Amino acid sequence: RKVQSGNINAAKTIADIIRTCLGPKSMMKMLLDPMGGIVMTNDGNAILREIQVQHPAAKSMIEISRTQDEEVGDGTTSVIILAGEMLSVAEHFLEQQMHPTVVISAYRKALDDMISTLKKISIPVDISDSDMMLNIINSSITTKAISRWSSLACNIALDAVKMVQFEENGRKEIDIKKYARVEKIPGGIIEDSCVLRGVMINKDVTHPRMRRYIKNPRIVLLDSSLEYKKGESQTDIEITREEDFTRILQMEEEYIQQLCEDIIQLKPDVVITEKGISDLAQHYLMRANITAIRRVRKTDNNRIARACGARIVSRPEELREDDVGTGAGLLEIKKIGDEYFTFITDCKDPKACTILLRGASKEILSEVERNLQDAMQVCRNVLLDPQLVPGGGASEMAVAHALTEKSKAMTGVEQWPYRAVAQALEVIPRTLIQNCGASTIRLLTSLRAKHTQENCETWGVNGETGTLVDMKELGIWEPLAVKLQTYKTAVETAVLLLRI
Amino acid sequence: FNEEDERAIEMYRRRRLAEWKATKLKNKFGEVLEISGKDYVQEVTKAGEGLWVILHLYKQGIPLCALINQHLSGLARKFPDVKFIKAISTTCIPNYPDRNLPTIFVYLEGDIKAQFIGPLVFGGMNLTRDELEWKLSESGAIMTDLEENPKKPIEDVLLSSVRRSVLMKR
Ligand SMILES: Nc1ncnc2c1ncn2[C@@H]1O[C@H](COP(=O)(O)OP(=O)(O)O)[C@@H](O)[C@H]1O
């Protein structure tokens, strides 16, 4: 019994570590290094990643936040605050009457019916027109930032995240981490920034006499190394027998030329490797008209082989036909930088991409990169679920009111925990009112009355004025996946913590 | 024709004959080794010049010299061409304070490098392996990857804002 009452303290104190950082208006906190240094941090993530704790429950409940942030990328502290608020002042009575299993059973159906109620209300939005998506994105990036060419960044973000799309494997699936790379190069006007249909690499050809400007290439992607020695297998075997060395160097030529002929049996205009290239292999290639690029990273091969134009299965050796034939555009080598840059551009339906932007200084480039990264995250989240739900705490109040009506409707035996959750779910509007700077009790009573009589289909609260206004003319909306994920994650973390 | 191919073959013959003076089986190591006696410096120093060693001094009591051993062994498996040693507080330096217990550093032949002292450099209860390869690879023995430790550079809002304001409109 005393285990739960001991573990709840760590959870509530970690929840209270950061609580006033939510919303537009927020405070800032200070950390003090043991030597004497001072850092004044605003991010919730930085604080809940730096301080280390002891009790295992606190460690697990910290790890949940980062694990969730790894995937969705939108909401981190809200689930922590909601879980702490629910845990603190709901279950301690029910423990005083010694019925934990009844509480869990009530929690399950409470989750089910609140999820159903949330699914009941929704408004669909069309996806054909991009202007209203741009407007929604602009409203979403109203978060604290610098408005320097924000519209351009939003437009490029929308274009890239729409172009990556999906390949009809396991229904719609959008990935942004692996098929989008940002590259920044100083010099030139900031207007020239745009999305590039192909892909850029920072390396160049291995010999000056090979052709560079090619039209309609036929690319082959190949792993492993062309050279083959395998010396470590046979070392110092009858050192006095140099005839063995002569014979092995003679027979290796047969293997090298066999590999070269097997490759050359097709028309692979370009050859990309990763490990290295010897002299016989490049000499044989240069006997014909082929170009080679050496030692590219793994991720670059992942982008290129991802239907950037060069549809290739990336087979190590003994390839087949139709696994090399590809439809691409132009291959070029540029001298824009001190190092030569490779361009494989003007392809068809390229599933990969490469986004580049230009600016005089580097720090403004870093800021612009952060801005468009956030925009891309939001736009990816939107396309998966094309329905929206009003925010500002109105949804929470409506759900709580519906739960109270149901509790007074059927009036089950275990209705007390149900009501406890119902009027313990309303912590967010109280925090918003407290941060605004007005009286909590009167505003909460007015909101309850409005939800009772007007049902508050879109009426909510304003975080910059503190007055009850309708959100139809305000324009505040949020997607649907984030709320469901937050509510679920809170439910199972509470159940898991109570199960011990 | 017969000129270029024969010339290429003969540079292979010359290069392969020049490579006949290669190493002398220096890959004996590749696993974790432990010593605990009076074998202080007569073993670590007495080796070939082209080695890459790493020593370690601990106490076995505090639960920070038990986490680092797993990471060190994991690096031992991946990299075969290095030397790894362990000891318990008494091989050298007969008296040693408990203030800076986990002591890890790299000898070179005649001149030590990259002295790591004290628990503050590691952080504490947060050493993921990647930070360990990064710290060890800041001086040689680099395998790949960069900028994998954002947890150290926390952003200071006020100073960074002042710098951005003074730089953007300068
Ligand atoms: N203009 C606004 N008025 C009222 N509430 C807002 C406004 N803008 C954002 N919010 C609310 O503040 C919350 C802050 O979200 P955020 O800062 O991302 O923290 P988290 O990552 O925990 O969601 C959001 O959930 C949103 O519902």
Author numbering:
A (entry chain C): 20 to 519
B (entry chain Q): 63 to 232
Paper text:
ATP-dependent chaperonin TRiC/CCT partners with cochaperones prefoldin (PFD) and phosducin-like proteins (PhLPs) to facilitate folding of essential eukaryotic proteins. The ring-shaped chaperonin TCP-1 ring complex (TRiC, also called CCT) is a ~1 MDa hetero-oligomeric complex that has a double-chamber architecture, with each octameric ring formed by subunits CCT1-81–3.
We, therefore, performed focused 3D classification on each CCT subunit. This analysis resolved an extended helical density that can be attributed to helix 3 (H3) of the NTD of PhLP2A adopting two different orientations associated with either the apical domain of CCT3 or CCT4. Notably, only the apical domains of CCT3 and CCT4 were predicted to form a dimeric complex with H3 of PhLP2A with good prediction scores, in agreement with our cryoEM density maps. The NTD of PhLP2A can adopt two different orientations, whereby H3 of the NTD contacts the apical regions of either CCT3 or CCT4. While the NTD is mostly negatively charged, H3 has a unique positively charged patch (residue 75–78), which displays a high degree of complementary to the negatively charged apical domains of CCT3 and CCT4 (Fig. 2a(i, ii), b). Mapping these crosslinks onto a predicted model of full-length PhLP2A suggests the NTD bends to place H1/H2 in the proximity of TXD. In good agreement with our PhLP2A-TRiC, we detected many intermolecular crosslinks between PhLP2A H3 and CCT3-CCT4 as well as between the PhLP2A TXD and CTD domains to the equatorial domains of CCT3 and CCT6 respectively (Fig. 1g(i, ii)).
